[PDB]
Symmetry: C2
Subunit: 102 residues, 2 copies
Amino acid sequence: SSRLANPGSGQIQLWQFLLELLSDSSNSSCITWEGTNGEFKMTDPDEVARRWGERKSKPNMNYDKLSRALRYYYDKNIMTKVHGKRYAYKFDFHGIAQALQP
Amino acid sequence: SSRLANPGSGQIQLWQFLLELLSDSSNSSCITWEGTNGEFKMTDPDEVARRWGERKSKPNMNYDKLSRALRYYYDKNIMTKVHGKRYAYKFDFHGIAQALQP
């Protein structure tokens, strides 16, 4: 259900889009690794939502909606919110490993 | 250099082979998640090496050699050994995320 797409594809899912941005340190002004395995923070959440909007060509993509989509992963063992930090989330390797299986 | 292959492929790299086994809990008698994001343990290292040997059709694959190949990741920000535990290693999300990029 949460499935691997081709990198840079329009069909990519949000979890894998975020990993794509994280994997290039040059994006750190909008999204960056925290340092603690799998934790990341959106230093510019609106720019993250803008870029997700552009990838998906969804009009009116905004942080309200991105945060709704992000909420959907908390049940899927893909990601959780990090409490006490601003715009901070943590990937779950255990759900991510399955996402790479057929 | 550490690159994504097709699941179940003979051309798969060791890091992704291990994730494949981890992703199916039924393999826990030889290899299983520890619970702490990305940490895993080989409950039967010889059976892990046997299965890697079978995938790769390498004769005389054994734990000595697997542990040599595993050593190669400690420089690549893919994996490190967990000290104080038996046959225990930890994936690094930061190197794994790049492994999914072109």
